[PDB]
Subunit: 255 residues, 2 copies
């Protein structure tokens, strides 16, 4: 068992590292596109030829980065150009002012917020960066980062895992029906903030269904957990911070 | 004598996506600076105000992307701007007119060249791309990525791993011992150009210190390794291609 806590911990730490790496690959996009002269170019003078170029510029990057979408928003919250410009789900002509990833980036310069997609209903990290001219803001570049990939790996690791934020909400998980569950408690009067924050409303916000929790001296714990399709089993849980985020990552190893 | 042959098989998969994410965060920056009217404009019409604008631009990117150095090289080999401009080790003014990353950039549009820093002595992947003007080539924009962080996550797995290119040279490795060793035999004649191309020339280019061997099915084999830390254990050996590269990752695992 203590010989299982050892191996669990390195798995954990490694999954957390692959996650770190994956978040940072995506952060490089808005980072480099905030300063990009053709972006700036387009916002200063948004003519059709110009915005078609950026449409294609971004189409290619969503595909080389592996963003679900990269898109560029007007001074006033309108998406003017978008990786998905040729698809019937083209964000172009959409209103993002009531964003959080929008208004926060407008206010602070950059933002990162895990939210459900208006039309999609698919979770992910909106990574955004304000675009500037000399002497004033011009708009916002957003790239949105989905975790189906790392969630798929873990699911094949044989040690399930989910990730919670500071508030305690599972954002990323290898078992989808644990998404938006809680790990703390949480406090009644911060619930709609949150539902709103998440762009969901009716998220569960109930505790993970872990039963029979036993804390261990070395900091592990055991619990019982009914995984889907399975009869109930006992697990070793270990935990680790995900570097350069404010997330904890939590892992189960079958006993 | 059962098959943790299924385990090393995925820890390796994990190691190799860790590596693709890390490389990929760096490929995005030359991919977009190469085309930037400011980067072009600087090269096409350089003046001090311009060139420091870039210097600053490159420090901010490099600092954010965790790139060891990003820098901009003249049509004629001279670095005109660099992320380390303010540092005493600034690449600004250096002649690189005959570095593989430079010349291959120019001919091919783009290059990924693994070498040892001239003055620094640290290994890294130099990622470069031609800047094109209305003229023809104007310069090259280069980003250098080092692999200490990922070699450290690999070392902590307790499954040493390393990555060979097409010439079977070990470029990246979780033991240092072991850099610039070899999976292939490498014929007499080839040592000096290969050394030149590693920019190191002192590279042992000896075959890896562990034989054993046999086959199979798969592409597997048994193995017995030097290293330190425990005399000389026995190890199984998995092999897997690192996606979006020509690198092969190999990994050994204790008995």
């Amino acid at each position: 068992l203590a010989g299982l806590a050892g191996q669990s911990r390195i798995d954990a730490s490694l999954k957390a590292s692959l996650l770190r790496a994956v978040v940072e690959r995506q952060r490089a996009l808005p980072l480099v596109l905030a300063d990009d002269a053709a972006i700036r170019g387009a916002l200063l003078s948004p003519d059709r030829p110009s915005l078609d170029r950026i449409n294609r510029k971004l189409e290619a990057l969503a595909t080389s980065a592996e963003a679900a979408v990269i898109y560029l928003i007007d001074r006033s919250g309108v998406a003017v150009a978008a990786s998905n410009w040729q698809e019937p789900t083209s964000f172009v002509g959409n209103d993002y002012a009531f964003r959080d990833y929008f208004r926060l980036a407008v206010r602070d310069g950059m933002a990162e917020h895990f939210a459900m997609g208006t039309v999609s209903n698919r979770p992910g990290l909106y990574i955004s960066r304000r675009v500037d001219g000399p002497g004033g803001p011009l708009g916002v570049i957003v790239a949105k980062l989905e975790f189906d990939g790392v969630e798929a790996d873990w699911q094949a690791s044989g040690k399930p895992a989910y990730v919670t934020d500071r508030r305690g909400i599972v954002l990323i998980t290898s078992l989808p029906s644990w998404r938006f569950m809680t790990t703390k408690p949480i406090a009644e009067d911060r619930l709609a903030p949150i539902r709103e924050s998440l762009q969901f409303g009716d998220a569960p916000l109930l505790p993970l269904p872990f039963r029979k929790i036993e804390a261990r001296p070395d900091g592990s714990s055991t619990l019982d957990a009914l995984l889907p399709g399975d009869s109930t089993a006992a697990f070793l849980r270990v935990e680790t911070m995900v570097p350069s985020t404010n997330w904890r990552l939590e892992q189960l190893s079958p006993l």
